[PDB]
RNA sequence: CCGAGCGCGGGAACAACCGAGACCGCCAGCUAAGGCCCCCAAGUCUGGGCUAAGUGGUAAAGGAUGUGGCGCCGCGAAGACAGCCAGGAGGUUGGCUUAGAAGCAGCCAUCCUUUAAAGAGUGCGUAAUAGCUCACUGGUCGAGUGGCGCCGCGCCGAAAAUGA
RNA sequence: GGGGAGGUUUGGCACCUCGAUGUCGGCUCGUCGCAUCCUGGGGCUGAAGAAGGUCCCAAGGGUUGGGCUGUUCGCCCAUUAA
RNA sequence: CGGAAGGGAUAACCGCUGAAAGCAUCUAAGCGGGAAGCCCGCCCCAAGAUGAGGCCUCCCACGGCGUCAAGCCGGUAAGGAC
């Protein structure tokens, strides 16, 4: 579900990071990949 | 790296293997080495090559007869090849062995006034239907009020003809030492005695 | 730290040891220097970027030392089938699903080793070149995917249903 | 030299005798056609007693140019018209009886079943 | 206010956004708007914090272990947090429905027990069991730790047609 | 249910233009914007390989003829990397 | 006959060592890779690039006033224009 102005966590694999710019959303299943666009 | 001077002779479709091939012969001719060039004392990578000798009276002046080795002045000048530097000897033909592609810079037939349909390629107009006013013309140019300017670098009507251009990749077929004729593929502009030279091609990798 | 030969230089701490000679470009912003058995590591205050560079400094330099302390364990294994891997000549020659053989030549800071062409090991000294080049091996081939074939340093395969899913 | 109107002929047994090229089934904006291109021609006339009928869109293998195609071996060859056969929507011609010669043009396309039937080669 | 002040100084350039009724001269100093890095006149002034994007060059609903400062609550040198060994139980497979529904699809739903400690069970897992699990708890261990409410600045949310 | 963006469409304003601004669509000549059709790429999969669904980056180039369409929305065949 | 090929940095993105916080983390210090895209490489223009740059060589005082200041004045050189 990449890219959207809001970004959130469902499970405890999901987390937030800063790098080279905007917000980034991760998880173990990378099916939970996002960005703040 | 490599190169040689030349004049265009022929173009025929000789039968190599069993094939009709466009063959331009290039009389590279006696091209003596003269003024050698280096970055420090001059600027860049170059040597000077004199296409063919035929000027005693009608030329005068320093003569690269002073240069170090005489050799007099050619029928038409010696030239500084981009990327080239030999030993001290006359380059002609046998430096190019059978089976190599080379770049080839030509100076070619001028034309003068040239139209668009044979400069670019537009659609002229109706040879009937609409106005017979327009017949052969490019039509529109730029936009209305905005932008409004005919754009800089635009494709318009004027001159097309004698241009200095290097062509890329053509096999060297054969070579003749006794009279000095290099035999290659089929193109070369200029007159059937116009001006053209070989460089070393920039092939694969 | 017995067989160490210490030295502290500007933004880069020079160290020598039994395996190789190296340094880690840290930072001349806190002060460290040769002493006792080890070296004193002190930051001049309690900033946050500080402490970042505190654990950083400590590690960094310790990682320089881990190489000289015989830390040449650079591990590789290849779980698959037709995944031959040879120590021919001096370097890597291996097929992992591809038809064209994969060749890899070793830079300075490493030595080579191939026991049985189904698992491979490099023996070198730089935690940077360790993971950069080794993950470059995991880049020589992408792992698992649905079942299990490819290169894993020592990683693991997770299954994603093959007998259906895509319909 | 064929285009989406170039009336062309056949030399087969099957049915049709005349069609009209639609496309060239290649580089779609090429349209020009010599001995080798592929016209999806629309059928125009056939024999009132048999299979394959007037006005069905068909794919088609091309032969016989009227401006000689430039041969590799030095030469140049052409026939007395502009014509050939159909290809069907599962490859090959729906034909079986050639009338007159062909060229090795077709041979260079690698379709032999046509060429074995070919009486004279050029 | 302009019109009647597109007279003057600012606003880069813009009658009415601000300053000021011009009678004329002045190589006289004051001074309003705004200004001192410059063209352009004026402090690379003096000083203590804040910001890390070029925010300032100009956007939001909403979203965030970006940073400083205030403040609330407990675990904790009886030893916390965090990483480790260890149980992580039994009636219970709770009831029920249901092809079966075992903490776990679900709805109704609160008992206690061997205790240091286990929740009618947190997510995962099976066809439903089995199973990884975590809460619980003891240690190992060594000095802090995790959550909430608050005030500033930055971050994203942010894609157009000539060249900026 | 919220809010925003962009100014291709149809409307609102009537403010330059009624002391002549001459029009759809078609030909002609282009140039641009990327919220991107195709080719590049990458992560995701309710992605076996073959193919597809989604978002993001990415213009350097490319994008057919035709019959009834006069024609605003055509339709279809034949293609095509589109 | 050719686009490419190759390099350099980089995006979306894939990773290393790495703490702040004894766990994590591609990022906070640094490193790897990464597009037909950016620049070069590749072909054209090109010294009014008022920067007129660089190079081979040719010729050569006063030959006559301006007593200083800058020039002027004709036959010439090397050459050139018709």
PDB file of N, CA and C (backbone and C1' of nucleotides) in Angstrom, chain E residues 159-164, chain F residues 6-8 30-38 57-63:
ATOM      1  P     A E 159       5.448  17.037  -5.386  1.00  0.00           P
ATOM      2  O5'   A E 159       4.263  17.124  -6.453  1.00  0.00           O
ATOM      3  C5'   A E 159       4.069  18.281  -7.259  1.00  0.00           C
ATOM      4  C4'   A E 159       3.596  17.905  -8.644  1.00  0.00           C
ATOM      5  C3'   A E 159       3.182  19.045  -9.565  1.00  0.00           C
ATOM      6  O3'   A E 159       4.290  19.688 -10.175  1.00  0.00           O
ATOM      7  C1'   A E 159       1.589  17.288  -9.687  1.00  0.00           C
ATOM      8  P     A E 160       4.241  21.257 -10.520  1.00  0.00           P
ATOM      9  O5'   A E 160       4.164  21.303 -12.109  1.00  0.00           O
ATOM     10  C5'   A E 160       2.948  21.034 -12.796  1.00  0.00           C
ATOM     11  C4'   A E 160       3.002  21.522 -14.224  1.00  0.00           C
ATOM     12  C3'   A E 160       2.741  23.015 -14.421  1.00  0.00           C
ATOM     13  O3'   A E 160       3.550  23.490 -15.497  1.00  0.00           O
ATOM     14  C1'   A E 160       1.159  21.768 -15.656  1.00  0.00           C
ATOM     15  P     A E 161       3.815  25.063 -15.690  1.00  0.00           P
ATOM     16  O5'   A E 161       3.511  25.308 -17.234  1.00  0.00           O
ATOM     17  C5'   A E 161       4.418  24.851 -18.223  1.00  0.00           C
ATOM     18  C4'   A E 161       3.713  24.173 -19.373  1.00  0.00           C
ATOM     19  C3'   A E 161       2.927  25.062 -20.320  1.00  0.00           C
ATOM     20  O3'   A E 161       3.751  25.756 -21.239  1.00  0.00           O
ATOM     21  C1'   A E 161       1.709  23.078 -19.860  1.00  0.00           C
ATOM     22  P     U E 162       3.924  27.347 -21.131  1.00  0.00           P
ATOM     23  O5'   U E 162       5.193  27.649 -22.041  1.00  0.00           O
ATOM     24  C5'   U E 162       5.793  26.634 -22.840  1.00  0.00           C
ATOM     25  C4'   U E 162       7.129  27.082 -23.375  1.00  0.00           C
ATOM     26  C3'   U E 162       8.255  27.102 -22.345  1.00  0.00           C
ATOM     27  O3'   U E 162       9.503  26.816 -22.975  1.00  0.00           O
ATOM     28  C1'   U E 162       7.867  29.298 -23.130  1.00  0.00           C
ATOM     29  P     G E 163      10.150  25.358 -22.807  1.00  0.00           P
ATOM     30  O5'   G E 163      11.519  25.594 -22.028  1.00  0.00           O
ATOM     31  C5'   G E 163      12.076  26.894 -21.876  1.00  0.00           C
ATOM     32  C4'   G E 163      12.658  27.082 -20.495  1.00  0.00           C
ATOM     33  C3'   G E 163      11.634  27.346 -19.394  1.00  0.00           C
ATOM     34  O3'   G E 163      12.092  26.788 -18.163  1.00  0.00           O
ATOM     35  C1'   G E 163      13.096  29.191 -19.570  1.00  0.00           C
ATOM     36  P     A E 164      11.066  26.545 -16.949  1.00  0.00           P
ATOM     37  O5'   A E 164      11.964  26.748 -15.647  1.00  0.00           O
ATOM     38  C5'   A E 164      11.597  27.669 -14.628  1.00  0.00           C
ATOM     39  C4'   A E 164      12.814  28.283 -13.977  1.00  0.00           C
ATOM     40  C3'   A E 164      12.553  29.258 -12.837  1.00  0.00           C
ATOM     41  O3'   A E 164      12.303  28.609 -11.598  1.00  0.00           O
ATOM     42  C1'   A E 164      14.135  30.189 -14.328  1.00  0.00           C
TER      43        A E 164
ATOM     44  P     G F   6      -2.714  23.828  -7.352  1.00  0.00           P
ATOM     45  O5'   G F   6      -3.026  23.159  -8.761  1.00  0.00           O
ATOM     46  C5'   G F   6      -2.012  22.492  -9.499  1.00  0.00           C
ATOM     47  C4'   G F   6      -2.610  21.776 -10.679  1.00  0.00           C
ATOM     48  C3'   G F   6      -3.446  22.652 -11.605  1.00  0.00           C
ATOM     49  O3'   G F   6      -2.663  23.297 -12.597  1.00  0.00           O
ATOM     50  C1'   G F   6      -4.690  20.738 -10.991  1.00  0.00           C
ATOM     51  P     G F   7      -2.979  24.814 -13.025  1.00  0.00           P
ATOM     52  O5'   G F   7      -4.324  24.705 -13.874  1.00  0.00           O
ATOM     53  C5'   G F   7      -4.331  24.129 -15.179  1.00  0.00           C
ATOM     54  C4'   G F   7      -5.684  24.252 -15.841  1.00  0.00           C
ATOM     55  C3'   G F   7      -6.061  25.656 -16.303  1.00  0.00           C
ATOM     56  O3'   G F   7      -6.945  25.565 -17.423  1.00  0.00           O
ATOM     57  C1'   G F   7      -7.553  24.955 -14.602  1.00  0.00           C
ATOM     58  P     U F   8      -6.367  25.462 -18.920  1.00  0.00           P
ATOM     59  O5'   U F   8      -7.234  24.301 -19.585  1.00  0.00           O
ATOM     60  C5'   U F   8      -7.360  23.024 -18.972  1.00  0.00           C
ATOM     61  C4'   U F   8      -7.698  21.967 -19.997  1.00  0.00           C
ATOM     62  C3'   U F   8      -9.152  21.846 -20.423  1.00  0.00           C
ATOM     63  O3'   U F   8      -9.518  22.842 -21.364  1.00  0.00           O
ATOM     64  C1'   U F   8      -8.164  19.689 -20.159  1.00  0.00           C
ATOM     65  P     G F  30       7.735  20.319 -37.948  1.00  0.00           P
ATOM     66  O5'   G F  30       6.623  20.178 -36.815  1.00  0.00           O
ATOM     67  C5'   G F  30       6.987  19.970 -35.461  1.00  0.00           C
ATOM     68  C4'   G F  30       7.128  21.276 -34.718  1.00  0.00           C
ATOM     69  C3'   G F  30       7.484  21.169 -33.243  1.00  0.00           C
ATOM     70  O3'   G F  30       8.871  20.952 -33.032  1.00  0.00           O
ATOM     71  C1'   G F  30       5.714  22.721 -33.524  1.00  0.00           C
ATOM     72  P     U F  31       9.364  20.034 -31.808  1.00  0.00           P
ATOM     73  O5'   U F  31       8.972  20.889 -30.526  1.00  0.00           O
ATOM     74  C5'   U F  31       9.580  22.151 -30.318  1.00  0.00           C
ATOM     75  C4'   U F  31       8.925  22.937 -29.213  1.00  0.00           C
ATOM     76  C3'   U F  31       8.640  22.209 -27.916  1.00  0.00           C
ATOM     77  O3'   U F  31       9.784  21.913 -27.142  1.00  0.00           O
ATOM     78  C1'   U F  31       6.794  23.538 -28.460  1.00  0.00           C
ATOM     79  P     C F  32       9.848  20.520 -26.346  1.00  0.00           P
ATOM     80  O5'   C F  32       8.933  20.776 -25.066  1.00  0.00           O
ATOM     81  C5'   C F  32       9.276  21.786 -24.126  1.00  0.00           C
ATOM     82  C4'   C F  32       8.071  22.340 -23.401  1.00  0.00           C
ATOM     83  C3'   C F  32       7.517  21.500 -22.259  1.00  0.00           C
ATOM     84  O3'   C F  32       8.229  21.699 -21.047  1.00  0.00           O
ATOM     85  C1'   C F  32       5.743  22.235 -23.648  1.00  0.00           C
ATOM     86  P     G F  33       7.798  20.928 -19.701  1.00  0.00           P
ATOM     87  O5'   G F  33       6.548  21.751 -19.152  1.00  0.00           O
ATOM     88  C5'   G F  33       6.260  21.803 -17.763  1.00  0.00           C
ATOM     89  C4'   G F  33       5.007  21.034 -17.429  1.00  0.00           C
ATOM     90  C3'   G F  33       5.201  19.578 -17.029  1.00  0.00           C
ATOM     91  O3'   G F  33       5.543  19.453 -15.657  1.00  0.00           O
ATOM     92  C1'   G F  33       3.383  19.788 -18.561  1.00  0.00           C
ATOM     93  P     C F  34       6.387  18.196 -15.123  1.00  0.00           P
ATOM     94  O5'   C F  34       5.370  16.980 -15.224  1.00  0.00           O
ATOM     95  C5'   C F  34       4.368  16.771 -14.233  1.00  0.00           C
ATOM     96  C4'   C F  34       3.745  15.409 -14.379  1.00  0.00           C
ATOM     97  C3'   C F  34       4.696  14.244 -14.111  1.00  0.00           C
ATOM     98  O3'   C F  34       3.944  13.103 -13.679  1.00  0.00           O
ATOM     99  C1'   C F  34       4.011  14.185 -16.359  1.00  0.00           C
ATOM    100  P     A F  35       3.531  12.891 -12.135  1.00  0.00           P
ATOM    101  O5'   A F  35       2.363  11.802 -12.198  1.00  0.00           O
ATOM    102  C5'   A F  35       1.485  11.581 -11.100  1.00  0.00           C
ATOM    103  C4'   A F  35       0.048  11.858 -11.476  1.00  0.00           C
ATOM    104  C3'   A F  35      -0.282  11.764 -12.964  1.00  0.00           C
ATOM    105  O3'   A F  35      -0.665  10.452 -13.341  1.00  0.00           O
ATOM    106  C1'   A F  35      -1.165  13.783 -12.038  1.00  0.00           C
ATOM    107  P     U F  36       0.398   9.407 -13.940  1.00  0.00           P
ATOM    108  O5'   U F  36       0.999  10.147 -15.216  1.00  0.00           O
ATOM    109  C5'   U F  36       0.237  10.290 -16.409  1.00  0.00           C
ATOM    110  C4'   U F  36       0.786   9.429 -17.519  1.00  0.00           C
ATOM    111  C3'   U F  36       0.695   7.925 -17.280  1.00  0.00           C
ATOM    112  O3'   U F  36       0.478   7.269 -18.527  1.00  0.00           O
ATOM    113  C1'   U F  36       2.963   8.541 -17.539  1.00  0.00           C
ATOM    114  P     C F  37      -0.972   6.676 -18.883  1.00  0.00           P
ATOM    115  O5'   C F  37      -0.672   5.142 -19.201  1.00  0.00           O
ATOM    116  C5'   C F  37      -1.694   4.253 -19.626  1.00  0.00           C
ATOM    117  C4'   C F  37      -1.415   3.716 -21.009  1.00  0.00           C
ATOM    118  C3'   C F  37      -0.133   2.910 -21.177  1.00  0.00           C
ATOM    119  O3'   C F  37      -0.278   1.551 -20.789  1.00  0.00           O
ATOM    120  C1'   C F  37      -0.300   4.512 -22.912  1.00  0.00           C
ATOM    121  P     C F  38       0.984   0.710 -20.250  1.00  0.00           P
ATOM    122  O5'   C F  38       2.030   0.757 -21.447  1.00  0.00           O
ATOM    123  C5'   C F  38       1.786   0.037 -22.646  1.00  0.00           C
ATOM    124  C4'   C F  38       2.970   0.093 -23.574  1.00  0.00           C
ATOM    125  C3'   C F  38       4.323  -0.171 -22.941  1.00  0.00           C
ATOM    126  O3'   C F  38       4.551  -1.552 -22.717  1.00  0.00           O
ATOM    127  C1'   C F  38       4.473   1.668 -24.435  1.00  0.00           C
ATOM    128  P     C F  57       5.963   9.702  -8.635  1.00  0.00           P
ATOM    129  O5'   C F  57       7.504   9.924  -8.968  1.00  0.00           O
ATOM    130  C5'   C F  57       8.475   9.926  -7.935  1.00  0.00           C
ATOM    131  C4'   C F  57       9.754   9.263  -8.379  1.00  0.00           C
ATOM    132  C3'   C F  57      10.196   9.551  -9.802  1.00  0.00           C
ATOM    133  O3'   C F  57      10.822  10.814  -9.949  1.00  0.00           O
ATOM    134  C1'   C F  57      10.380   7.236  -9.383  1.00  0.00           C
ATOM    135  P     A F  58      10.368  11.803 -11.132  1.00  0.00           P
ATOM    136  O5'   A F  58      11.009  11.157 -12.440  1.00  0.00           O
ATOM    137  C5'   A F  58      12.355  10.704 -12.445  1.00  0.00           C
ATOM    138  C4'   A F  58      12.596   9.683 -13.529  1.00  0.00           C
ATOM    139  C3'   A F  58      12.084  10.049 -14.911  1.00  0.00           C
ATOM    140  O3'   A F  58      12.958  10.929 -15.591  1.00  0.00           O
ATOM    141  C1'   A F  58      11.527   7.798 -14.416  1.00  0.00           C
ATOM    142  P     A F  59      12.507  12.439 -15.897  1.00  0.00           P
ATOM    143  O5'   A F  59      11.545  12.297 -17.158  1.00  0.00           O
ATOM    144  C5'   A F  59      11.457  13.333 -18.130  1.00  0.00           C
ATOM    145  C4'   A F  59      11.877  12.845 -19.492  1.00  0.00           C
ATOM    146  C3'   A F  59      11.677  13.838 -20.636  1.00  0.00           C
ATOM    147  O3'   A F  59      12.711  13.646 -21.595  1.00  0.00           O
ATOM    148  C1'   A F  59      10.450  11.874 -21.075  1.00  0.00           C
ATOM    149  P     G F  60      14.031  14.552 -21.546  1.00  0.00           P
ATOM    150  O5'   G F  60      14.600  14.458 -23.027  1.00  0.00           O
ATOM    151  C5'   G F  60      15.874  13.889 -23.268  1.00  0.00           C
ATOM    152  C4'   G F  60      15.800  12.671 -24.156  1.00  0.00           C
ATOM    153  C3'   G F  60      14.628  12.567 -25.117  1.00  0.00           C
ATOM    154  O3'   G F  60      14.744  13.421 -26.247  1.00  0.00           O
ATOM    155  C1'   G F  60      15.117  10.439 -24.169  1.00  0.00           C
ATOM    156  P     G F  61      13.433  13.897 -27.052  1.00  0.00           P
ATOM    157  O5'   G F  61      12.828  12.555 -27.661  1.00  0.00           O
ATOM    158  C5'   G F  61      13.290  12.048 -28.905  1.00  0.00           C
ATOM    159  C4'   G F  61      13.056  10.562 -29.029  1.00  0.00           C
ATOM    160  C3'   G F  61      11.740  10.133 -29.654  1.00  0.00           C
ATOM    161  O3'   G F  61      11.751  10.217 -31.067  1.00  0.00           O
ATOM    162  C1'   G F  61      12.162   8.833 -27.724  1.00  0.00           C
ATOM    163  P     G F  62      10.395  10.546 -31.866  1.00  0.00           P
ATOM    164  O5'   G F  62       9.477   9.264 -31.621  1.00  0.00           O
ATOM    165  C5'   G F  62       9.750   8.030 -32.269  1.00  0.00           C
ATOM    166  C4'   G F  62       8.725   6.982 -31.915  1.00  0.00           C
ATOM    167  C3'   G F  62       7.281   7.318 -32.264  1.00  0.00           C
ATOM    168  O3'   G F  62       6.973   6.989 -33.610  1.00  0.00           O
ATOM    169  C1'   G F  62       7.410   6.492 -30.039  1.00  0.00           C
ATOM    170  P     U F  63       5.887   7.831 -34.441  1.00  0.00           P
ATOM    171  O5'   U F  63       4.500   7.459 -33.752  1.00  0.00           O
ATOM    172  C5'   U F  63       3.922   6.180 -33.961  1.00  0.00           C
ATOM    173  C4'   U F  63       2.906   5.837 -32.901  1.00  0.00           C
ATOM    174  C3'   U F  63       1.606   6.623 -32.925  1.00  0.00           C
ATOM    175  O3'   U F  63       0.709   6.135 -33.902  1.00  0.00           O
ATOM    176  C1'   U F  63       2.388   6.397 -30.694  1.00  0.00           C
TER     177        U F  63
END
